[PDB]
Amino acid sequence: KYVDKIHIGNYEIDAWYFSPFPEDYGKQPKLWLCEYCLKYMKYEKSYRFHLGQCQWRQPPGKEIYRKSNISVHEVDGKDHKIYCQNLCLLAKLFLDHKTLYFDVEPFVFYILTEVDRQGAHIVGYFSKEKESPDGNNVSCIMILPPYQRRGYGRFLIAFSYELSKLESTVGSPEKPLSDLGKLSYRSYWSSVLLENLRDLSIKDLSQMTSITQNDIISTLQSLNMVKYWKGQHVICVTPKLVEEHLKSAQYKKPPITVDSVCLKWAPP
Numbered sequence: 001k002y003v004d005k006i007h008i009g010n011y012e013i014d015a016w017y018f019s020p021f022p023e024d025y026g027k028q029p030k031l032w033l034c035e036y037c038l039k040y041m042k043y044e045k046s047y048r049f050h051l052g053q054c055q056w057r058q059p060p061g062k063e064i065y066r067k068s069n070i071s072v073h074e075v076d077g078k079d080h081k082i083y084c085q086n087l088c089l090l091a092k093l094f095l096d097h098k099t100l101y102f103d104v105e106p107f108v109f110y111i112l113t114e115v116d117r118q119g120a121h122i123v124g125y126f127s128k129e130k131e132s133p134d135g136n137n138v139s140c141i142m143i144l145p146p147y148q149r150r151g152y153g154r155f156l157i158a159f160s161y162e163l164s165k166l167e168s169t170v171g172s173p174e175k176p177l178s179d180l181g182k183l184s185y186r187s188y189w190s191s192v193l194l195e196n197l198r199d200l201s202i203k204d205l206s207q208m209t210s211i212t213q214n215d216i217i218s219t220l221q222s223l224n225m226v227k228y229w230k231g232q233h234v235i236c237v238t239p240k241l242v243e244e245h246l247k248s249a250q251y252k253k254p255p256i257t258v259d260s261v262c263l264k265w266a267p268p
């Protein structure tokens with residue numbers, strides 16, 4: 001018998017997948033999570049007592065981004081082991097393909113929070129290998145279900161590439177992506193490339209965006225904006241074609257932007 005329901009903050013959320021919480025936790029009808037320190041508890045009564053005792057009102061680590069009430073905390077897995085393990089167990093309830101939960105020392109975790117008077121409430125996160133031999137700028141990326149399809153996933157994608165830009169490198173999410181993750185990356189790639197083409201080789205777009213040439217090419221191919229000539233992909237678009245795509249309905253929701261001026265981060 002697995003965890004199938006959690007209470008976190010003011011949300012109740014049904015599980016999507018098995019997560020390896022200890023057996024005596026899974027047997028409970030519901031798992032209760034502190035939204036600030038991510039301690040998981042078996043009972044409403046232990047949860048209530050914890051909420052009156054727990055002093056955390058935001059993630060640990062350093063706040064590397066803050067604009068208005070949107071915040072990102074960078075949490076090193078070796079410095080905040082228990083917190084990152086609890087985050088990975090929570091994330092695994094909603095990710096099919098995540099496989100690492102307890103060996104969190106090789107990872108850095110970027111926690112997205114939405115702030116009010118009571119504290120900084122967790123929306124989602126992405127993990128990132130401190131040293132990625134494969135050039136992955138995201139390992140896992142997860143938005144909690146009640147915040148999905150509301151701009152927060154796009155924010156975290158954009159954020160991951162802003163880190164890659166500051167590292168003077170290109171990067172790509174680790175595969176396989178969740179179904180919603182695939183749609184989200186394709187939408188983000190399309191809007192970023194189209195806006196750059198409206199305002200350039202494939203290599204130029206890559207240096208400007210930190211999107212890999214492969215991801216640029218596959219995105220341009222889905223837009224039918226690339227020709228093939230003697231073994232080379234070449235951009236083939238008219239400014240008018242770019243503008244038709246850009247004012248289609250899917251590019252109409254006003255994003256939460258990543259303001260590079262509010263990003264406080266030096267590359268390792």
Ligand SMILES: C=CCOc1cc(C)c(F)c(C(=O)NNS(=O)(=O)c2ccccc2)c1
Nearest residue numbers: 142143148149150151152153154181184187
């Ligand atoms: C639970 C497992 C994975 O959860 C995820 C993972 C990712 C990467 C997401 F992007 C989202 C999400 O919520 N996307 N919707 S979006 O932010 O409005 C958005 C609009 C336009 C372009 C991009 C994104 C959820």
Ligand code: NA
Nearest residue numbers: 012013014145
């Ligand atoms: Na639910």
Ligand SMILES: [Zn+2]
Nearest residue numbers: 034037039054
């Ligand atoms: Zn707590």
